[model samples]
Target: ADTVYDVTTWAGATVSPYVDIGAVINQIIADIKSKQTTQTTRPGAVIYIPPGHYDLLTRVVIDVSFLQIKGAGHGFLSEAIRDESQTGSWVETLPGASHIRVRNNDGHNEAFLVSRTGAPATVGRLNSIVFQDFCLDGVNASKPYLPGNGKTGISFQSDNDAVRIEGMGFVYLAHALIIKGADAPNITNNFIAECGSSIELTGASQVAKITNNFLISAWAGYSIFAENAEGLQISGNTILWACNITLSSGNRASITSNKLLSNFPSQIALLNNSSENLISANHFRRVHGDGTSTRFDDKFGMVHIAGNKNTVTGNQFSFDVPSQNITPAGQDPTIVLVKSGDNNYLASNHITSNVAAKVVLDASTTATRVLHSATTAQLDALTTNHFMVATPSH
Candidate 1:
């Protein structure tokens, strides 16, 4: 037997009048728990948050599957202001939930969404989840007032998960997004600015795509930190005023098509452990800000293809050095290709008007080859002699 009830009719039938959000959410949780134990048929649910500023003193946790928590066209904004001594996360997801979506309707506020706990084995699988169109503003002093270690927007601690975050903006936080032990995540078109670190991916992460995102940090450590991950793709990102993009350990990772401008220490800094990574097709211009001396450093091994590898025909490197005139040595190498590993390729790249030498190979490693060409005919001839055919078009 099936029963149909309209919202207007259901409101009329209730005796105690309208229900608060706490009551509604509690009732939904009870219904879901009952279904989990009794093995009864359960229907999907949609919980809507109307457009308003919700001053919640407590955190929100969701433990139900097949649930869609949506907001009005403006969305719900949660604000909880406290002192610097107080530190805590905002939203958390309980173990054993799947197929959930949290989307903003149109509102603007700082709502930290979904910090998960426990192992992936206990948390019964999370799939097809999205966090879109939300703004997370880390409210703190414009300058450093306190000791300055008390802001984190979103933190995930789940394993074997796939999460997509799009159209979100984070500002003035200690760490904008920290993905610990999560895998196969897609972070695109998000603006992360004014933070300590924009994104930190630690532990074992495989096949993560971080593309089309604008990361601007003034006093941060690193814009994007990928530690011990394999198969990472970082492309089409614009990083401004950050420290570096340091990868501790990775294999077959690609960093391409990014606009690295105005970073203080160096544009791209790789340690001795990062190996088998591809750095190609990126516009690295005006890097090494006022107080810095270097642009790119590779003390380790295995960085292949300085610029566009496949499309050896159309790779361009334009350098816009700052007018600080601190370095007595006028103009350094725009492309610092260090060969600490074997079989690292430095292929077709066009350098234009760099202050220093076009390329600097580290002196510690020998047996290095540089293929430079002035015209397309020379490039094609070199490619034919080495790679057996014409360079592939990208």
Candidate 2:
């Protein structure tokens, strides 16, 4: 049996408009369960709400398994179903220790209210969950303080497997999306705008796929930041007006056919002993930053690589919108491969306009080549059992 519990039925819900849904939701769920039973093994009940932005100042914790929260539609500001605490709230707090789904109508305006200490709209430390078809609006730092710089929009963590946050929109926050310590998470088909860092996968997290997302104006941080992530598959994302993907100590990260436009400082970077990564079939333009506003100088040029045994092929790196960007030269290399790394390969890539130094390489690095002989040879040249080596934590 499927029960639809309308939120307005709660006590004083009509008179008291700014009710924290998290506080009494458990009681409501219990009451519904007592009245409803299934003829067969079925999914849980639905907590449905009509079109109204309630003053909800609570964090939703999923204490039960196989439940769903569905809304008719979404609205923000005066019309949004929003949590009142912009700097402190969550859609799921029990970390999804039980499988759950929080689904809203297409184009629903729902948000968890950005927080610094607490993760805004978090799903982690648990498994088998999905958050689909809604918007996570950070309220644009609508609140402040307490290591408040994070202001992240969506945060996922733990070793949770079989998870998905799909078909959502993220806006006005420090970071649009962040995943830490996840296993086989599928984050795809989302749109993010006006954020600090667009999409970040870090902390030993491994994703099944990250595809078909559009990110714009990641002014504060990189469009994508992958640190210590393993076996990540990224493809078909249109990233604009941001420093695109940065991999620090990430391994087996595969990037293919991504459209990177108008980046500043750096694009498609690999560093800090990063190894066994492949960047191929991507489109890039003006992907250099002047090292003025960020850590993005010559050290992290377009397609910069600092670690060993990385590969790049079948890509188009272009630009030179008149006099080009970096000037006085030598301050930074347009494309750099660090001296400490080895066995990096680049071939079949079409680069237009020009570079600061044209194949910038330091004597400290070894085996930088076009892979004409035997498919790039491979990564063991950098370390013993380099394939299984643990990525650095920093």
Candidate 3:
């Protein structure tokens, strides 16, 4: 009977004032499985939520397994920057910690639903579930585009193991975390900003360890959208602005030392056939297209390798604008768009620019290798199995 339910004094919970803390934590997980007679010997809980505001209109269904739904501080505030600083006599400070105002509705917007009833090998799958420190408020205020209103906070829909989301505080959501199948999931130090997609590891999820999260989204997808996630270990995160980091059919992933900022243009994509990845020491910034933008700068890239034998080393790419805002000016934007894949390996990279930025190699890429690089940018190759060993120290 490992319990500690305290949805403000649980017993028949009715924490007053339009109560619904997701039905008082689903009646304290149905009385902790009614003192378990044998649902695999249910006995692992700690549902605590103290501090203040709570109104999750029901959707807290965790089919139970070593659960730990803690809270009492992670009351993040920034109702989309208080509705974008609306000065109609604006007032603030409304999240006094442990907040959970996600008025669930449209298609049952999940507040917390880690399902598992049977068959994952018969009554197994869920294990070591934990969601610490809370504040999931999709009370949008102003940040719209609710993605057809599926505002999720945590919805590991079936099959799970070692799932953990720490220091959480996902605001205006449309998806803060939605791992459909977990293995060693541990998304740490979360803040996950103005969301519309912050961390979404699809069905084939495995060995995920997205660390030091801040993952701010600029909406149009990807702040970390992995499919077929294999050994993903995106380190030291800080993905800001326009957002990006896609990995479809992703494999052997390990994008390290992150700080990928963007103004939009694939800040880190390794779509489809992703392979043996290991992009090290990252810091890719992009600020392209601004002069009356009407789209005409040919497939912009900050790192859009289409996947195969990946390994971009000691990274650093900065497109410092100027040169008429690079949208149709001197025409030169690309910091690595290897585009197809095959024996890829770009070493010691560091590209800075004032326009004329490039490092592309896309003739369906073959035996690609651009070693000992130090760029002011410019190394386009349609491929002869491409291999450039230096130039652009201009």
Pick by TM-score: which candidate is best?
A: 2
- What are the Cα lDDT values of the candidates? 0.49, 0.56, 0.77
Clashing pairs in 3: none
lDDT of 1: 0.49
- Compose the digit string of candidate 1's lDDT tens values, residues 1-394: 1122211133322221122232334444455455555324544354444333332222234444344444323121222222323436635211111111222222422123344456557655444345554444454434221123445556655553677766566655666777766578888887776666778887767888899988875533667777778888999999876535766666667788887765343456555456667767776554444334333322111122221111222245555555454243343433444434334445566655334333444434333334552222222111212322222323
Model 3, 277-377: lDDT tens digits are: 89899888877442123322535577788878999899888877666656545677777788897998889878877666788788888998888763424
Q: Model 3: runs farther than 4 Å from truth?
A: 1-13, 17-20, 28-61, 64-78, 81-119, 124-152, 155-175, 180-193, 206-222, 230-241, 248-268, 271-300, 309-332, 343-359, 362-379, 386-394
List TM-score per model, in order. Answer: 0.63, 0.68, 0.42
List the candidate 2 regions with Cα displacement exceeding 4 Å. 2-56, 62-125, 141-150, 287-292, 321-333, 336-339, 354-357, 371-394
Look at candidate 2 and tell me the lDDT of residue 289: 44
Q: Is candidate 2 or candidate 3 better by TM-score?
A: 2
Give one digit per residue, the lDDT tens place, for model 2 in 1-394: 3365656665623333235443345556566556545534334566654444443334343432344454432122211123343524554322111111222122322223111233324532445556555455444242111122345555554345656666666555566666666678787777665556777776777755888887764444777788778888889988876646888888898899899875464777787888889988888776444223444554455677888888888877675533344543444345434445878777766556453233455656776664321122111233231222211222
Residue 284 local lDDT, model 3: 84
Q: Tell me how far the alpha carbon of residue 383 in candidate 2 is from the true structure, in angstroms, after superposition.
A: 19
State which candidate has the highest lDDT: 3
Q: On TM-score, who's better, 1 or 3?
A: 1
Q: Pairing residues by index, what is the TM-score of model 1?
A: 0.63
